[PDB]
Each structure stands twice: as structure tokens, then as C-alpha cells.
Amino acid sequence: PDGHEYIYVDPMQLPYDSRWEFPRDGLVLGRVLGSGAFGKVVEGTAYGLSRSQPVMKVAVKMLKPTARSSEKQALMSELKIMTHLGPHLNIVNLLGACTKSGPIYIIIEYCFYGDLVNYLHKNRDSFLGLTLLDLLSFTYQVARGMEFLASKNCVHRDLAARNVLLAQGKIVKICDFGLARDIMTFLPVKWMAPESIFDNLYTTLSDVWSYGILLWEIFSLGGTPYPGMMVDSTFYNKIKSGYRMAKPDHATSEVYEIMVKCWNSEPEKRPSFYHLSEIVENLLPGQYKKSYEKIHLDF
Numbered sequence: 001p002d003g004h005e006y007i008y009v010d011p012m013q014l015p016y017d018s019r020w021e022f023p024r025d026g027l028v029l030g031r032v033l034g035s036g037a038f039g040k041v042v043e044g045t046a047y048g049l050s051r052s053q054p055v056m057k058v059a060v061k062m063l064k065p066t067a068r069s070s071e072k073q074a075l076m077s078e079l080k081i082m083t084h085l086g087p088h089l090n091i092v093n094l095l096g097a098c099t100k101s102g103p104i105y106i107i108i109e110y111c112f113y114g115d116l117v118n119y120l121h122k123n124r125d126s127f128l129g130l131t132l133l134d135l136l137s138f139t140y141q142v143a144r145g146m147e148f149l150a151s152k153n154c155v156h157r158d159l160a161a162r163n164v165l166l167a168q169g170k171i172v173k174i175c176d177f178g179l180a181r182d183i184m185t186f187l188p189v190k191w192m193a194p195e196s197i198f199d200n201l202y203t204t205l206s207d208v209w210s211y212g213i214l215l216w217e218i219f220s221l222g223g224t225p226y227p228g229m230m231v232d233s234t235f236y237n238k239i240k241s242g243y244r245m246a247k248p249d250h251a252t253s254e255v256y257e258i259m260v261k262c263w264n265s266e267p268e269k270r271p272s273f274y275h276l277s278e279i280v281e282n283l284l285p286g287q288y289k290k291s292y293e294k295i296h297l298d299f
């Protein structure tokens with residue numbers, strides 16, 4: 001800090017804009033989309049949330065009655081981050097919330113095709129329909145969305161294929177900001193950088209490590225990272241020594257080269273999400289680049 005005049009703007013301290021508030025009785029709760037020990041996401045129908053769509057399908061993140069304060073305070077914090085983030089094409093964007101007079105409801109875009117893990121398991125036989133160019137489009141859009149998070153000093157801390165969703169028009173959207181921290185329990189260690197596991201250090205650079213693991217998931221068509229390996233003292237010794245995963249079945253040399261850079265042991269030698277977007281842009285048609293900025297512009 002150059003002087004006392006220059007303050008860090010903490011999103012937790014910022015007031016809640018009531019333009020996000022949506023009446024609880026304009027919301028119909030439908031089938032479960034995801035579930036946990038003390039929380040769940042359900043499908044919903046929102047009446048009067050959008051002028052363009054007076055009756056529009058959405059998804060609703062909510063806690064179970066089993067939840068007990070610790071998860072309740074965090075769900076409120078997850079809402080503060082999403083309100084201060086602003087919108088982006090490749091983020092499941094916040095639509096509204098039910099914060100008054102009862103449990104917290106977070107209302108987000110519904111994504112037609114679901115998570116990338118199950119989406120690729122379905123389309124395995126289609127692969128050799130779903131092409132390799134599709135996987136590169138998924139790879140590129142995640143890099144743009146993480147570039148957006150990093151530009152807002154937002155560390156996702158749980159980037160993976162399960163938290164990447166596919167919406168209408170094959171538009172990739174990153175979801176689940178429950179672990180998201182503004183820079184300065186049970187953990188997804190197989191997606192975590194060594195300095196995260198060992199030194200509790202989470203940066204945008206440790207997201208890049210997780211981006212590498214996500215890349216492996218995509219080009220293994222939904223495979224389990226480090227398959228057959230239990231996470232134990234020997235696993236931590238291999239990760240720390242320098243063990244990496246072998247190239248998956250369908251990735252090219254250029255694509256495996258990206259994972260290798262993402263898994264560099266020195267966090268500062270890993271590439272930026274800006275440079276990662278530039279690299280993947282080469283590996284795609286030029287029609288794609290103009291086709292993306294037109295979608296990004298209209299949004």
C-alpha cells in the first residue's frame with residue numbers, strides 16, 4: 001500500500017444491492033440438480049424475473065435444514081462475491097437472490113446440457129457428433145472465464161470438469177464459487193497445486209494448475225485424474241518430487257504441452273490465463289475467433 005489513501009475493496013464489506021432481490025413466491029422449486037451433505041442445487045421456474053422471459057427456467061442454490069451456520073455464513077459470502085464480480089459470458093451468472101425473511105436462495109442461469117464430466121461420458125462413442133474441435137472450444141472458453149476471474153483478483157480454488165457447465169449454443173460456463181476467495185474442510189487435492197496442498201497458498205497461479213487437471217479431464221473424455229492412485233503419503237511424495245500424469249488418449253502434443261506448463265513446480269513459471277487463451281486461439285480456426293467475439297459482444 002503506497003499510502004493510507006489506497007484501500008483494498010473487500011467485497012464482503014460492500015452493501016447488498018436490493019436490485020438482486022427476488023420475491024420468494026415467484027419461484028417454483030423443481031428437481032434436484034446437485035446435492036451434498038448440507039446443501040443442494042435444484043431446478044427452478046422464475047415468474048417475472050426477466051422481461052424477455054416472464055416464465056424462465058433457472059437453477060437455485062440453497063442449503064438443507066441440515067446446514068448449520070458455518071455453511072450458512074459462507075453461502076452469504078458466495079453471494080457477495082458474485083454480486084461484485086459482474087457478468088461474463090463463461091460464468092454461470094447470478095440472476096437474483098432470496099435473502100430476506102428466510103433461508104438464502106441464490107438464483108443462477110440454468111445450463112441445458114449439465115456438467116462436463118457427465119456430458120463427455122455420454123458422447124464417448126460419438127468421438128471416433130462430438131469432435132476434437134469441440135474439446136478445444138471448451139478449453140478456450142474456460143481460459144477466457146478464468147481470465148475474467150483473475151482480472152477481478154478472484155481465486156476459484158475448485159476449478160475442475162464437474163464445475164464446468166454447458167449451456168445453450170455450446171457456451172461453457174464456470175460455476176460453484178463456494179470456495180472462491182478474493183486474493184489476500186474437504187479439499188479437491190487431485191486438482192490442487194503443491195503449494196496449495198502443502199502451504200495453504202491459493203493464487204490465480206494455483207488455478208492454472210487446476211486448469212491443467214481440467215485439461216486432462218476434457219481430453220480423457222471425463223477421466224479420473226491420477227486413476228488408480230489413492231491420495232496418501234506416497235501420492236504426496238510423487239506430486240512433490242515432480243510426478244505428473246501421462247498424456248491422455250486423445251490429446252495432441254500441443255495440448256499436452258499446455259498441461260505440462262500448467263503443472264510447472266514453480267508457480268510463476270506457469271502461464272497466464274491470457275497467454276493460455278492466446279495459445280488455444282492458435283489451435284482453432286480463425287472463423288472461431290470472430291465467431292466468439294460476436295457472441296461475447298451480443299451478451
Ligand SMILES: CCN[C@@](C)(c1ccc(F)cc1)c1cnc(N2CCN(c3ncnn4cc(-c5cnn(C)c5)cc34)CC2)nc1
Nearest residue numbers: 033034035036039040041059062063109110111113114178
Ligand atoms: C460447495 C458445493 N456443494 C454443493 C452441494 C452445495 C449446494 C448448495 C449449497 F448451499 C452449498 C453447497 C453443490 C452441489 N452441486 C452444485 N452444482 C450442481 C448444479 N449445477 C447447475 N447449475 C445450473 N444449471 N444446471 C443444469 C444442470 C444439469 C444437470 N443435468 N442436466 C441435463 C442439466 C446442472 C446445473 C451447478 C452447481 N453446486 C453446489
